[PDB]
DNA sequence: CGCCGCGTCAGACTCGTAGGATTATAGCATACGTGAGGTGGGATGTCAAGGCCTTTTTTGCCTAAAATGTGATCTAGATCACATTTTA
């Protein structure tokens, strides 16, 4: 939480600076730490994104009726 | 008794079209456990040569014994130009 903190606090800054966003290369390199925390905290950063949106913009399809269940079997290969 | 206000509750059906989110939240110190890493060590699994038995491959061998050789003495077939001679 806190490395999250300081992340979009500077970035913000380096925004102003650059006038564009940083990179994680000269992201890594203002936060003190090298790249692979960078990607790996941008990684962990992502919410869920609740099952009963209608990505039909019409009232046709919440998204779980898109969902495949890959679990269970085929009967092919059953027999 | 008979309004009136407020609130509850349905609004046809099968296909197709697109990807998709966002704000800001302090900071460092203590101390404890769990994940990714080492590490000898039973124990399991493999791979190459040897002792029990039967079968198989050579291989003795065992005697019936029928077969393989010895060669001078024959024999019953086999020929060819001429002289007819028969048959369709």
């Not at 936060?31 to 019409?58: F, H, N, Q, W």
Request: glycine share 4%; proline share 8%.
């Amino acid at each position: 939480i806190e490395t999250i903190n300081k992340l979009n606090r500077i970035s913000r800054q380096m925004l102003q600076e650059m006038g564009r966003e940083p990179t994680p290369e000269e992201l890594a390199e203002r936060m003190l730490m090298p790249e692979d925390k960078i990607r790996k905290v941008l990684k962990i950063a992502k919410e869920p994104i609740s099952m009963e949106t209608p990505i039909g913009d019409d009232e046709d399809s919440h998204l779980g009726d898109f969902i495949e269940d890959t679990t269970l079997e085929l009967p092919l290969d059953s027999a």
